[PDB]
């Protein structure tokens, strides 16, 4: 057999350089593959006058249905070599520059990725009719000579040494090159410095770093030490430069000597942020077969970074082997060459396996490499309101029900929601212009069923595919990012969440909050000790449901007595696990973002009174339950317990308010803070505190009369009426949400709110607690701003009276004689842009500040 290591792009059209192995020897062979395109014509007639060496056939496959074309023609499949494709590219009399052209599907497919899809990682030749194999060796091999082979024999075991090269960029501006020899006994480090006055010599410290990690990673190397490396005890060499120009020449000599050390029988693990510039600067690596991993930029301080960076170098050197074995295990199932697959981006294997099944099912790909838009026959890059609506709108409708709850409020975490949604598409549904092609979605649904069935056999590769499909769909970087596909999955996710709400409501349980992961529901029970078996019965009954059988529902927290506003404003009493305890190991959680819109003297008093409110509510609920058991809830009459201290406390606070607000010594405690969500202006801080307390007490649907009388009595001391303009409550945070921002580590797809969340939970993941870079956050705010601006500029105009959409595109007024007004308000966009300016001024997004600067000019 011929197991393939690397498919390699070349400067020649249609010619690729292929590195395979035979008997442990790395063979390099030039390969010629013609390109196949799909051509849509105006009519059924074929004008083919004289075209040199081209196969033109009729094709029976439907097309990706973009909404602007959803005539009397036929699809045709044309195979021709890429060089002669360039020969009739320049001829305007050819069929490729015809005026009867409707579309050119799959015209941008490279020979490299086509050879990846068609031939797999295991290729064999056919010798039924072959004059000379050597004539095929220098003259190249055609695809009619080749076919697939067995996947398991691919990289069973290689007796071949690795060459490990890393580039380190630092935050202080230093540059590092490192070269490893498994056959040699040297690790070589090239270090750049701006000046020779800066000191970084740590050879004895590097030896001590190696001695520190030696016992630490001895137990970790030994899992794969019998295959990937011979001797782990090698010596350290270093060289220093103050410039970069001769540093390329030194690296070129030190990498050229590897070629004479081994003789073209080793692969290179290359990890640098720059690849094309690297292969431009140094030459012999370009012919060399390379496995690639894009490396994160190392962020290091000005001093004491040196043991950290040497620790990192030893960590990569001693942890390369498990990564290499994981590449082998990935390539065993993925049927992709080890050099050509990207381990760092999991979407490539998803795209090529998907496109393999698409090509198996006789349907035209929308494989587009160098643009997130699909091919769609080449009639893309044209604006349409349909594709702008289904590609622009990313909004997950949360179901929020504010109030106080005395039932055992259950927190369930929903995992694989997107996967369980897209897998059971045949059960959710139990000419459309904005619909994805149905047969391709049947292909993906069956493929995900196969992946899920293989995942139960503990295939970690298939586990990684089924956990990475949800990130593959959302990613525009992938080759098959189709907006119709993503809108199909998002709309089906909305439908599946609403059906989950209906299924939980059919068991006598009303939800509190619904989201992609966290769902809070209200049961019929009062105590969790009576509610545990009922909760288990409920979750097993919804796991029994046919539409939800792949949904990972796990209980996160039991809530006994809860106050709900949204996910960012909740307080109450909770327990993680149920226990046989009289106190039940209860804890009190208060997460008010309302507290931050208050003066610093008045912030802890809000938490104090919330604690008093919570304790009085538990005491009233316990007394009512003990009295009654032996429409209004258990909480009626709870404010008789603490209104008498609260009136006196408000009057004393009012007396303190009328003394020290204007005094410059105590005014620093009385200031209002500036927050990115803040849009209101406070007039009396005690009035705002009283409004916030009476509004959180006002969320009770049962005792709203008594709370209203308490608010009426409390508003008398400020000399305000019951229903004043300033007495009513408004939310002091305007909601700025970015949709579906996912971490690369734990793949948790969440919507990040930049106004109502704490700064600690914004820049890092919610569960993984790994910090995002600020650059992509800035980029996503630019995307959200331009999405809102684009949604303003493409806009229907409606009547002020008829409320009818504008059909005749340019007219003075409607037949109902009402004026034209925008569907979006005139003030909504400028409040959105003002909140963007405020959040840019707060969090210091200088790119977003520059965007506002160029937007105003």
């Amino acid at each position: 057999t011929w197991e393939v290591l690397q498919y390699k792009d070349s400067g020649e059209p249609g010619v690729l350089e292929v590195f395979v192995t035979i008997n442990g020897k790395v063979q390099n062979i030039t390969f010629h593959i013609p390109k196949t395109i799909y051509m849509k014509f105006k009519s059924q007639t074929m004008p083919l006058q004289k075209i040199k060496n081209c196969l033109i056939e009729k094709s029976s496959a439907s097309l990706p249905n973009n909404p602007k074309t959803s005539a009397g023609g036929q699809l045709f499949k044309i195979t021709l070599p890429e060089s002669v494709f360039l020969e009739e590219k320049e001829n305007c009399t050819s069929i490729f520059n015809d005026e009867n052209v409707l579309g050119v599907f799959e015209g941008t497919i490279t020979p490299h990725q086509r050879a990846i899809m068609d031939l797999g990682a295991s290729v064999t030749f056919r010798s039924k009719a072959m004059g000379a194999l050597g004539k095929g060796i220098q003259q190249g091999f055609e695809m009619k000579d080749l076919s697939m082979a067995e996947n398991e024999r691919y990289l069973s075991g290689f007796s071949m040494d690795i060459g490990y090269l890393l580039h380190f960029p630092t935050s202080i501006g230093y540059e590092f090159f490192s070269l490893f020899k498994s056959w040699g006994d040297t690790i070589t480090i090239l270090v750049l410095k701006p000046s020779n006055q800066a000191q970084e010599i740590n050879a004895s410290s590097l030896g001590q770093i190696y001695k520190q990690m030696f016992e630490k990673k001895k137990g970790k190397i030994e899992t794969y030490s019998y295959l990937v490396d011979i001797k782990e005890d090698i010596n350290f060499e270093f060289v220093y430069f103050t410039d970069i120009s001769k540093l390329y020449r030194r690296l070129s000599q030190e990498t050229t000597k590897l070629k004479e050390e081994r003789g073209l029988q080793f692969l290179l693990l290359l990890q640098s942020p720059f690849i094309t510039k690297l292969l431009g600067t140094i030459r012999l690596l370009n012919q060399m077969p390379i496995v690639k991993l894009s490396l994160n930029e190392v962020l290091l301080p000005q001093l004491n970074w040196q043991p950290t960076l040497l620790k990192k170098l030893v960590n990569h050197v001693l942890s390369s082997g498990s990564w290499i074995s994981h590449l082998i295990k990935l390539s065993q199932y993925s049927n992709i060459p080890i050099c050509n697959l990207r381990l760092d981006s999991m979407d490539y294997i998803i795209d090529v396996l998907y496109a393999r099944k698409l090509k198996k099912e006789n349907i035209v790909l929308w494989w587009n490499e160098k643009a997130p838009l699909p091919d769609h026959g080449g009639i893309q890059n044209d604006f349409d309101l349909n594709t702008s609506w289904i590609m622009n709108d990313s909004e997950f409708p949360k179901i929020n029900n504010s109030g106080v709850y005395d039932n055992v409020v259950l927190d369930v975490g929903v995992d694989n929601l997107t996967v369980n949604t897209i897998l059971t598409s045949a059960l959710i549904n139990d000419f459309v212009h904005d619909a994805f092609s149905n047969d391709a979605l049947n292909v993906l649904r069956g493929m995900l069923k196969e992946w899920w069935d293989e995942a139960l056999k503990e295939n970690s590769t298939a586990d990684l595919l089924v956990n990475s499909l949800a990130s593959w769909v959302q990613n525009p970087n992938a080759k098959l990012f189709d907006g119709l596909l993503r809108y199909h999955v998002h709309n089906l996710t909305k439908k599946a969440l609403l059906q989950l709400v209906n299924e939980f409501s059919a068991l006598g349980s009303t939800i509190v909050y619904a989201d992609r992961n966290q769902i809070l529901i209200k049961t019929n029970k009062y105590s969790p000790e009576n509610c545990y078996a009922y909760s288990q019965y409920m979750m097993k009954a919804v796991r029994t449901n046919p539409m939800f059988s792949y949904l990972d529902l796990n209980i996160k927290r039991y809530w006994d007595l809860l106050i709900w506003m949204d996910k960012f404003n909740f307080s109450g009493l909770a327990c993680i696990e149920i226990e046989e305890k009289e106190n039940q190991d209860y804890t009190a959680v208060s997460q008010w973002q309302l507290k931050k819109f208050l003066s610093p003297i008045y912030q802890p008093e809000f938490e104090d009174w919330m604690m008093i409110i919570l304790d009085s509510m538990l005491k009233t609920k316990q007394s009512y339950l003990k009295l009654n058991s032996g429409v209004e809830n258990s909480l009626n009459g709870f404010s008789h317990l603490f209104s008498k201290p609260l009136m006196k406390r408000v009057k004393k606070l009012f007396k303190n308010q009328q003394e020290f607000i204007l005094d410059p010594q105590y005014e620093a405690d009385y200031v209002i803070p500036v927050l990115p969500g803040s849009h209101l202006n406070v007039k009396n801080p005690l009035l705002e505190l009283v409004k916030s307390l009476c509004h959180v007490m006002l969320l009770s649907k049962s005792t709203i009369l008594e709370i209203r009388t308490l608010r009426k009595e409390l508003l008398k001391i400020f000399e305000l009426r019951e229903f004043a303009k300033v007495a009513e409550f408004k939310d002091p945070s305007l909601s700025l949400v970015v949709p579906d921002f996912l971490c690369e580590y734990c793949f948790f797809i969440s919507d990040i709110d930049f106004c109502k969340a704490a700064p600690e939970s914004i820049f890092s993941c919610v569960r993984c607690h790994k910090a995002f870079n600020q650059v992509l956050l800035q980029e996503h705010l630019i995307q959200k701003l331009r999405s809102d601006i684009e949604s303003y500029l493409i806009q229907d105009l409606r009547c002020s009276r008829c409320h009818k959409v504008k059909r005749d595109y340019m007219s003075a007024h409607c037949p109902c004689a009402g004026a034209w007004e925008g569907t979006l308000p005139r003030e909504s966009i400028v409040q959105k842009l003002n909140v963007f300016k405020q959040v840019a001024k707060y969090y210091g997004f200088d790119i977003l500040l520059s965007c506002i600067a160029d937007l105003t000019i």
Partner: protein
Amino acid sequence: MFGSGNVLPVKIQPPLLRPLAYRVLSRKYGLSIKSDGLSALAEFVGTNIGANWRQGPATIKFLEQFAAVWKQQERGLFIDQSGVKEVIQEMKEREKVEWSHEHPILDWRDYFKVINASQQQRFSYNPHKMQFIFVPNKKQNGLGGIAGFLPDIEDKVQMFLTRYYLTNDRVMRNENFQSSMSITPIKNLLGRDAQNFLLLGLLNKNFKGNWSLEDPSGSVEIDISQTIPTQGHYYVPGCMVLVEGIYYSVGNKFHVTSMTLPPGERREITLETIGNLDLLGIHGISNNNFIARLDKDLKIRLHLLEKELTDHKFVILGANLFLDDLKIMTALSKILQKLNDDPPTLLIWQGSFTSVPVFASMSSRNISSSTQFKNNFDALATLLSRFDNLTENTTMIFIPGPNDLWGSMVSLGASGTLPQDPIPSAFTKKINKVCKNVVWSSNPTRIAYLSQEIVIFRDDLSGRFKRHRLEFPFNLPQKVQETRKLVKTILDQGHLSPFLDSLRPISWDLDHTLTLCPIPSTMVLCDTTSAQFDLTYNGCKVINPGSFIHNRRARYMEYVPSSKKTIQEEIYI
């Protein structure tokens, strides 16, 4: 310039200028003098004269000239210190021309300017006032959030009717309709059974999916079975076309015999119809009370000095040049060395600067795509640091491509809003540390070079025109023929992109830039889907380089404006 003064300047004051202020120009010519303008006049008389300001007749003659010049512009009844500065600079130019008249022996930088789509003055037509009217810019007015990128809600309604009445004026001015038939508004047609009518209509597809013609008075459905279209033209939805045919009242349909576009008019015809309005603002700026008038003698003098300057060249690269490709980098280095042999006047750089669209990726370990854009501009500045002659003697103009950072952030490389804004300044600051004078302009760019108005536009016109062309049942080199069809369609519309709003949106407040009611003398459409060409039509020059690479060759242009001549030069890469 001015006459030489022998003695040194002194700082004379507004005191003791009091008899020599109100009598000489405020009574003889009627111009009130403010304090700051009087102080600036005292400073300039001091610097011109010296100690003989008390008994010098040159002061009195200079103040009479000041009052006379303020009478030709009539910029205000008062006298402003900034107004004194503008009049002094115009006098320096004026006596520079007069010194060149005395001895036959200005500057091109004094009159050359660059206008983005945001900086262009707004004009709107009114047939209740029967002419044009200028609208002051609202970018300064109000909050910058309100002013920037938030147009008024009526402007979407007003945009296509403004284009309609402009097209109606351009077809009513032609000799064919001052002769053959007359244009009837569409609303009058329903009721006239079986009578022949000629129309101007916005071509549209209605909600029913049939073809329709629309005016501000209404619309009618048409059918295109019996049409005989005029050969040599392009028909796309969004065209305002002349339609001749018979209306039938049975099914409310209009049977079209022939269809054509309205005929074009030359540039000087449009300027004499408007009355020589300085639309770009080559002399000052237009205000609310007074509109800026382009002087005829000034235009003749600029044409004369334009014919005097013959060595000025405009080097135009082929569009769609990718900064990330190394072969493009090498070819750009070679052609910039060839331009380092002789630096031109302007080097207009354009095209989609990156191959991939810049999107919000999900690879936090790697450098971002915007970081890739910034690094590519830094590498461009590093290459531009090698060539001193281009950064010393040649200004450069940057036109955005369809795939640049700023516009295609949400469009993701697709068609977006038509007035594409310039590349952000924060992403390219090192270029501003290299070039002496670099202007980052919008996608429709109006540069005024002396008496010449030049429009730069980067758009893939021919692919969209061929894809949505009007197909008919009843219906010479090919590239030249399609070239003449494209240029004749674009000049007969008087619009850069005459598509519907569904095909390509236009931001509402800035459509007058894309409206080409003043036909420019020379514009450069940059269409990579079409081949390179150079034609003149209706007194306009339309030139096109296409893509940057065409079979291992880098294509560029040398356009001289004095003889109005373009040399097409290719470089074998």
